[PDB]
Design an enzyme around this catalytic site. Structure first.
Site, PDB file in Angstrom:
ATOM      1  N   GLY A  21      79.262  82.565  35.150  1.00  0.00           N
ATOM      2  CA  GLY A  21      78.146  81.780  35.632  1.00  0.00           C
ATOM      3  C   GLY A  21      77.531  82.440  36.842  1.00  0.00           C
ATOM      4  N   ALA A  22      76.744  81.690  37.608  1.00  0.00           N
ATOM      5  CA  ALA A  22      76.112  82.292  38.774  1.00  0.00           C
ATOM      6  C   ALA A  22      77.127  82.734  39.827  1.00  0.00           C
ATOM      7  CB  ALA A  22      75.098  81.314  39.381  1.00  0.00           C
ATOM      8  N   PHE A  23      78.352  82.191  39.814  1.00  0.00           N
ATOM      9  CA  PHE A  23      79.293  82.423  40.908  1.00  0.00           C
ATOM     10  C   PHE A  23      80.452  83.368  40.586  1.00  0.00           C
ATOM     11  CE2 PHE A  23      77.698  77.972  41.409  1.00  0.00           C
ATOM     12  CZ  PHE A  23      76.843  78.220  42.467  1.00  0.00           C
ATOM     13  N   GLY A  24      80.814  83.556  39.326  1.00  0.00           N
ATOM     14  CA  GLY A  24      81.932  84.440  39.052  1.00  0.00           C
ATOM     15  C   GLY A  24      82.180  84.569  37.569  1.00  0.00           C
ATOM     16  N   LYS A  45      88.952  81.948  37.886  1.00  0.00           N
ATOM     17  CA  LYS A  45      87.590  82.354  38.198  1.00  0.00           C
ATOM     18  C   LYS A  45      87.634  83.374  39.330  1.00  0.00           C
ATOM     19  CE  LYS A  45      83.821  79.601  38.800  1.00  0.00           C
ATOM     20  NZ  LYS A  45      82.863  78.973  37.850  1.00  0.00           N
ATOM     21  N   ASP A 137      75.260  71.381  42.277  1.00  0.00           N
ATOM     22  CA  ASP A 137      75.007  72.147  41.062  1.00  0.00           C
ATOM     23  C   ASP A 137      75.529  71.392  39.843  1.00  0.00           C
ATOM     24  OD1 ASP A 137      74.012  74.221  39.485  1.00  0.00           O
ATOM     25  OD2 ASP A 137      75.712  75.573  39.850  1.00  0.00           O
ATOM     26  N   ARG A 141      76.526  72.419  31.959  1.00  0.00           N
ATOM     27  CA  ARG A 141      77.326  73.642  31.982  1.00  0.00           C
ATOM     28  C   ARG A 141      78.487  73.538  32.967  1.00  0.00           C
ATOM     29  NH1 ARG A 141      72.445  74.820  34.946  1.00  0.00           N
ATOM     30  NH2 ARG A 141      73.004  75.233  37.142  1.00  0.00           N
ATOM     31  N   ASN A 142      78.387  72.643  33.960  1.00  0.00           N
ATOM     32  CA  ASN A 142      79.447  72.392  34.932  1.00  0.00           C
ATOM     33  C   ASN A 142      80.211  71.115  34.642  1.00  0.00           C
ATOM     34  OD1 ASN A 142      79.540  74.587  36.710  1.00  0.00           O
ATOM     35  ND2 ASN A 142      77.653  73.899  37.692  1.00  0.00           N
ATOM     36  N   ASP A 155      83.449  73.074  39.405  1.00  0.00           N
ATOM     37  CA  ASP A 155      82.670  73.946  40.275  1.00  0.00           C
ATOM     38  C   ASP A 155      82.161  73.231  41.510  1.00  0.00           C
ATOM     39  OD1 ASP A 155      83.041  76.357  39.085  1.00  0.00           O
ATOM     40  OD2 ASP A 155      81.060  76.459  38.114  1.00  0.00           O
TER      41      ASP A 155
HETATM   42  C1  LIG Z   1      80.538  80.044  31.156  1.00  0.00           C
HETATM   43  O1  LIG Z   1      81.448  79.150  31.741  1.00  0.00           O
HETATM   44  C2  LIG Z   1      82.095  79.649  32.888  1.00  0.00           C
HETATM   45  C3  LIG Z   1      81.484  79.011  34.139  1.00  0.00           C
HETATM   46  C4  LIG Z   1      81.842  77.527  34.170  1.00  0.00           C
HETATM   47  C5  LIG Z   1      83.350  77.395  34.403  1.00  0.00           C
HETATM   48  N1  LIG Z   1      83.993  77.652  35.552  1.00  0.00           N
HETATM   49  C6  LIG Z   1      85.269  77.432  35.333  1.00  0.00           C
HETATM   50  C7  LIG Z   1      86.351  77.585  36.377  1.00  0.00           C
HETATM   51  C8  LIG Z   1      87.687  78.244  36.058  1.00  0.00           C
HETATM   52  C9  LIG Z   1      88.727  78.341  37.152  1.00  0.00           C
HETATM   53  C10 LIG Z   1      88.426  77.808  38.542  1.00  0.00           C
HETATM   54  F1  LIG Z   1      89.360  77.892  39.522  1.00  0.00           F
HETATM   55  C11 LIG Z   1      87.096  77.161  38.846  1.00  0.00           C
HETATM   56  C12 LIG Z   1      86.055  77.050  37.762  1.00  0.00           C
HETATM   57  C13 LIG Z   1      85.449  77.047  34.034  1.00  0.00           C
HETATM   58  C14 LIG Z   1      86.728  76.615  33.306  1.00  0.00           C
HETATM   59  C15 LIG Z   1      87.760  75.910  34.066  1.00  0.00           C
HETATM   60  C16 LIG Z   1      88.996  75.440  33.406  1.00  0.00           C
HETATM   61  N2  LIG Z   1      89.174  75.640  31.969  1.00  0.00           N
HETATM   62  C17 LIG Z   1      88.085  76.350  31.168  1.00  0.00           C
HETATM   63  C18 LIG Z   1      86.921  76.808  31.789  1.00  0.00           C
HETATM   64  C19 LIG Z   1      86.140  77.407  30.826  1.00  0.00           C
HETATM   65  C20 LIG Z   1      86.820  77.301  29.612  1.00  0.00           C
HETATM   66  C21 LIG Z   1      86.371  77.817  28.264  1.00  0.00           C
HETATM   67  C22 LIG Z   1      85.050  78.570  28.118  1.00  0.00           C
HETATM   68  C23 LIG Z   1      84.638  79.069  26.743  1.00  0.00           C
HETATM   69  C24 LIG Z   1      85.532  78.822  25.532  1.00  0.00           C
HETATM   70  C25 LIG Z   1      86.838  78.053  25.682  1.00  0.00           C
HETATM   71  C26 LIG Z   1      87.262  77.552  27.057  1.00  0.00           C
HETATM   72  N3  LIG Z   1      88.015  76.656  29.831  1.00  0.00           N
HETATM   73  N4  LIG Z   1      84.261  77.018  33.481  1.00  0.00           N
HETATM   74 CL   LIG Z   2      80.219  80.506  37.621  1.00  0.00          CL
END
Ligand SMILES: COCCCc1nc(-c2ccc(F)cc2)c(-c2ccnc3c2CC(c2ccccc2)=N3)[nH]1
Ligand SMILES: [Cl-]
Ligand SMILES: COCCCc1nc(-c2ccc(F)cc2)c(-c2ccnc3c2CC(c2ccccc2)=N3)[nH]1
Ligand SMILES: [Cl-]
Lengths: 299, 314
Positions: A21-24, A45, A137, A141-142, A155
């Site tokens: 995403g925009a952050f990582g 992340k 935000d 998506r979040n 997020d």
């Molecule tokens: C394109 O999105 C990524 C950006 C949104 C996002 N930030 C995070 C994130 C992870 C760790 C952190 F410390 C803080 C934030 C997640 C997340 C968190 C926990 N579990 C998940 C997922 C995504 C996910 C997934 C995505 C695609 C297919 C299958 C599973 N599982 N998402």
């Molecule tokens: Cl992100």
């Protein structure tokens, strides 16, 4: 305090990219507790990198706040690894984010699901507001799917630590003001995303033009499936006077009453076949995947 | 009845063998919910055939009982599949069984862990007794590790569901745990809560010896004769007499003089509050339970269910 585990690089490993995403960049990772042989899936992340680089102490201050969020509908930061980069660790949710979920299940999601997701998202934002935490935000998506019946805001707090014009309140566009009431605006847009099964807001309109169209009085249109009762909540979320917008506490009540008679407030071709999980499907999901307390769903 | 999900073959796949035991073969499996694209890890157990042509709805009735247990120290059965085989589904526990755990971590396991495992196992068996269920095969191999701080009993009632066809005079390859069984169970196939308590005593002994085999050397065919003469399992070197005396009470010939599970909870709970007084383990001060930070982390990832707090040292 004890709520945030600082990890070392050697106790976890990234194994697959899941998104970005925009952050990582988001990774599926494996946590390996020292002196054990198990590999425990986790979501990791790795933050993009310093806009204006933040001090290590400030990064940890904010990570502690994120790790203190304790609500069934907000993702809690579980751990952090501070090296040359910042890596965030949270419980992994295999279903992914709600935006992709409603897209992949376009026309096949029941009204009972969509109104219950609105309830849950409000409950989580209400919890942040009661802690005086501004999200900045909120968007579909979040919002992450733990199970189809249980969603969670993710997020929180990254936007402040590290622009989605089409989700932002007008005063955020103009003056970069962020408040619980500008979060309510984003909430209206997030609900609009859900009820259009994941349409892009203002699709084909230039970001540069949004402030103009908003001051003009135009808003996102009434979703095909939405009765006017749902669309008017959305409109009230997008009033110019931040103080006239609904409060999250009220949104919880309103959507909860709607979920108690879902097919009256949403008109979906085929709502015949999709309902909530039976008690046995619900126990099965919960027993395998989702053991945390949480309230009951609105039936 | 809403507690047991009947699964069709089309909803799950066995993806990897985890182990095998007297009652069947365990698999890491993947559940695929109808209409979804995610693969949810599960534990699947394919049962060996019953020793008698059971109704197949009697199988379901015994499965409903297994899916009805609600306690933090007892594994609940979650689903079942009746096809070419009887297949059992529940939550997958990456750490495996407590027997393997103590064997691989011998020398790294402190008194606080050992006494707390005894507490939790008695709590789980107390709950089965409260639900009027006899386990019949309580042993360290049938205690699963959810986290190192949280163990749960499994495989209760499978001995009764499947039977054994008189393999009780075999050498040790037999499906029958002669060396964990109460004398009255060996002699007369009597199984009560009080025979479960004898098996509980052997389980503590397994833990206190870090996974030794009970009565090793002694043939199984000879066990009832050595028990009738008063021979019992030896005092583990780490055990103070106080701990060994409870194990010996569990193996009293007279069933109703053995301890009750509800009393074993209390007694081991009292010992866990002063662990170094009851178990002497070299380097024990380096082997405490997890800090709050680490258990907070363990729970949020692996173990979100409500659980009695472990008994900390006073
Ligand atoms: C394109 O999105 C990524 C950006 C949104 C996002 N930030 C995070 C994130 C992870 C760790 C952190 F410390 C803080 C934030 C997640 C997340 C968190 C926990 N579990 C998940 C997922 C995504 C996910 C997934 C995505 C695609 C297919 C299958 C599973 N599982 N998402
Ligand atoms: Cl992100
Ligand atoms: C390793 O147990 C010893 C064998 C006895 C057993 N019966 C079961 C079982 C499985 C499904 C059911 F419906 C009912 C009972 C399990 C089990 C249950 C849940 N999760 C697990 C495991 C084993 C395991 C493992 C094994 C080796 C290495 C790593 C992990 N994970 N065990
Ligand atoms: Cl087995």
């Amino acid at each position: 305090q004890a709520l945030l585990r600082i990890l070392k690089e050697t106790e976890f490993k990234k194994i697959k990219v899941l998104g970005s995403g925009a952050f990582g960049t988001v990774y599926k990772g494996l946590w390996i507790p020292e002196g054990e042989k198990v590999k425990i899936p986790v979501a990791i992340k790795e933050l993009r990198e310093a806009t204006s680089p933040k001090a290590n102490k400030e990064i940890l201050d904010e990570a502690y706040v994120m790790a203190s969020v304790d609500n069934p509908h907000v993702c809690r930061l579980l751990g952090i690894c501070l090296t040359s980069t910042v890596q965030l660790i949270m419980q992994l949710m295999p279903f992914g984010c709600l935006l992709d979920y409603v897209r992949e299940h376009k026309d096949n999601i029941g009204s009972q699901y969509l109104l219950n997701w609105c309830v849950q998202i409000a409950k989580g934002m209400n919890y942040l507001e009661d802690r005086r935490l501004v999200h900045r935000d909120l968007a579909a998506r979040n919002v992450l799917v733990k199970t189809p019946q249980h969603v969670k805001i993710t997020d929180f707090g990254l936007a402040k630590l590290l622009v989605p014009i089409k989700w932002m309140a007008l005063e955020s566009i103009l003056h970069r003001i962020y408040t619980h009431q500008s979060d309510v605006w984003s909430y209206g847009v997030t609900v609009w995303e859900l009820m259009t099964f994941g349409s892009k807001p203002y699709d084909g309109i230039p970001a540069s033009e949004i402030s103009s169209i908003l001051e003009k009085g135009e808003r996102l249109p009434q979703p095909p499936i939405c009765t006017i009762d749902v669309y008017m909540i959305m409109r009230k979320c997008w009033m110019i006077d931040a103080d006239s917008r609904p409060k999250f506490r009220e949104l919880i009540i309103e959507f909860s009453k709607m979920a108690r008679d879902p097919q009256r407030y949403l008109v979906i071709q085929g709502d015949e076949r999709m309902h909530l999980p039976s008690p046995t499907d619900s126990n099965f999901y919960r027993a395998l995947m989702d053991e945390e307390d949480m309230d009951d769903v609105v039936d």
